[PDB]
């Protein structure tokens, strides 16, 4: 049921999504180990993901959270990086995309920093790098991130190192 629509680089929507991508790059404490050494990206394509059923699934739950939190979904746009983005866009997020060993428990993780989600694109800790060259810092191979609409509702604040 999923269709992908290419956005033109002239389209304001392409531009606002790219800007969020580029402007949330940061240096990482691993010196590039997991995700590579870079200050910016070369954006090759931005596609809008359209699936009626997954969207209605989302908005149904959103309304439930909202009514539990004084009509405030607390909705954000956040990045998600993984080797399974091509399953996510067809079947939605579910428990198979949960980071079992994450700092905040077995859930589905999102980042404000695009460069953070980039660390997970080839696996946890960058896995073994790109499939073709085994390079966590590959400058050749195409990578894919999701920029996702996320309902946080009432969020538990964890201070953390």
């Amino acid at each position: 049921g999923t269709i992908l629509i290419d956005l033109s680089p002239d389209d304001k929507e392409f531009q606002s999504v790219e800007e969020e991508m580029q402007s949330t790059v940061r240096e990482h404490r691993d010196g590039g180990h997991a995700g590579g050494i870079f200050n910016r990206y070369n954006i090759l394509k931005i596609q809008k993901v359209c699936n009626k059923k997954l969207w209605e699934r989302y908005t149904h739950r959103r309304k439930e959270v909202s009514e539990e939190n004084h009509n405030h979904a607390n909705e954000r746009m956040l990045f998600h990086g993984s080797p399974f983005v091509n399953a996510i866009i067809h079947k939605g997020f579910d428990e198979r995309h949960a980071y079992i060993g994450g700092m905040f428990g077995a859930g589905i993780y999102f980042a404000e920093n695009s460069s953070k989600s980039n660390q997970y694109v080839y696996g946890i800790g960058g896995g073994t790098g790109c499939p073709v060259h085994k390079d966590r810092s590959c400058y050749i191979c195409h990578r894919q991130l999701l920029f996702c609409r996320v309902t946080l509702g009432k969020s538990f604040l964890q201070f953390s190192a």
């Binding site: 992908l4 999504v17 949330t24 940061r26 240096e27 995700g35 590579g36 050494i37 870079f38 200050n39 990206y41 954006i43 090759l44 394509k45 931005i46 596609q47 809008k48 989302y58 739950r61 959103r62 939190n69 607390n74 939605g92 997020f93 579910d94 428990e95 905040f104 428990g105 077995a106 859930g107 589905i108 993780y109 999102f110 980042a111 404000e112 920093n113 953070k116 980039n118 810092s137 400058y139 050749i140 195409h142 990578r143 894919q144 991130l145 999701l146 920029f147 996702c148 996320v150 309902t151 946080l152 509702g153 009432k154 969020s155 538990f156 604040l157 964890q158 201070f159 953390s160 190192a161």
Partner: protein, 47 residues
């Protein structure tokens, strides 16, 4: 997949050391996210 903390719908990991780090977030129900944009890119080698 674990549950939310009782009385909450997600967790926010607030950075407390790396002054430059932005927040990270965790949800416990797949229906609480929609994968709106697929972005294909390469990282660029710095000069």
């Amino acid at each position: 997949m674990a549950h939310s903390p009782p009385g909450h719908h997600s967790v926010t990991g607030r950075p407390s050391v790396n002054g430059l780090a932005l927040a990270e977030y965790v949800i416990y129900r797949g229906e609480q996210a929609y994968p709106e944009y697929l972005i294909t890119y390469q990282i660029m080698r710095p000069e």
